[PDB]
Design a protein around this ligand. Sequence first.
Ligand SMILES: Nc1ncnc2c1ncn2[C@@H]1O[C@H](COP(=O)(O)OP(=O)(O)O)[C@@H](O)[C@H]1O
Lengths: 134, 249
Amino acid sequence: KPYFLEAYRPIRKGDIFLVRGGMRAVEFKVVETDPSPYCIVAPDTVIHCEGEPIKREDEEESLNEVGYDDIGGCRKQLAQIKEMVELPLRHPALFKAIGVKPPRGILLYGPPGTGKTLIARAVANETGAFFFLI
Amino acid sequence: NRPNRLIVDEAINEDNSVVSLSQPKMDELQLFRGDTVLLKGKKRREAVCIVLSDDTCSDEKIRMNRVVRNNLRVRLGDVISIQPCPDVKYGKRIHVLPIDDTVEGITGNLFEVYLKPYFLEAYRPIRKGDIFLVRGGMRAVEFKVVETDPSPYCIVAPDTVIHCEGEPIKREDEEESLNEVGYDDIGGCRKQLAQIKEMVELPLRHPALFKAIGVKPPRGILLYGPPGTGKTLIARAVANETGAFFFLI
Ligand SMILES: Nc1ncnc2c1ncn2[C@@H]1O[C@H](COP(=O)(O)OP(=O)(O)O)[C@@H](O)[C@H]1O
């Protein structure tokens, strides 16, 4: 409470920081969103701390976001994938403007325990593209 | 027997609004290569184009490309008339417009780069309703001459102006797009493509003929070969080159 004072949280959901009334090391994360865009809070409002503090689902997400800096021994195989998927995902407008064929199927074959799903998560996060696991 | 009409056939020259004809039948119709000539087409249309004299084509068949065969709404196996046009006119401002969704995903005054070289020196004899097409930068797009300041058919001259504006308009249901496939879209299958054409050109362009004689036509064909050779492509091209309905499974 002693921090949303005359600086009523100009924020953007995803801004994480430190705020406490004590040992001065605790996070403040996004849980809810009544307004889709970020706003500036005001008193007289209503808040529900019914929510419970959680594990580092967010930190695991951050580790996945680290991506390329979390693996080793596949320098070549990680460069080939980058040049193959970055362009379609990052700038789809360029591919829309022209008639060219991107890829829609990639197959990775290798012995078990070689960090394959990890590579997929590392590539999806570094480019911001949504990732679904089956 | 009235050598004024003539049969259709494909074209080896790809340039738009251009044809090629037998060499001896230049006095019969009595006109020359440069002599621009108008050609009739069903649904009450006629399109003008340049002439040329060759030999490989028979003395009974014209050569032309898919664009005019589309605006003329006619396929192979058909026949139309013809007439010289020494009364042709120098086309003044004849407005055009990018007529497709192909306009999608693009920017710039593409009119200039795509047109100015295409029309330059071509002396393109153009008439209203033309659906000519030009290709550049990984893309292929067309335009329609909507306006003919002198009507209906005229020549292109470099002085002629182009106020190039307008909003992509909606192609009607009559015409069909350049995207749809054809024999010109395939290569390396001339032998079997010719076999298929000679096999199944009669039952679709001449069914009443089959009902007029007692003969058993084929009712099943099998094509065998490795994948990625263009078999479904061949089937769709044959369907599009005869107007027959196509169904896929
Ligand atoms: N002979 C050919 N001429 C033109 N394009 C071809 C040819 N063979 C293959 N292609 C191209 O590759 C693809 C051929 O694959 P496809 O038609 O599916 O063959 P199949 O059905 O036997 O797998 C087509 O999309 C076409 O663009």
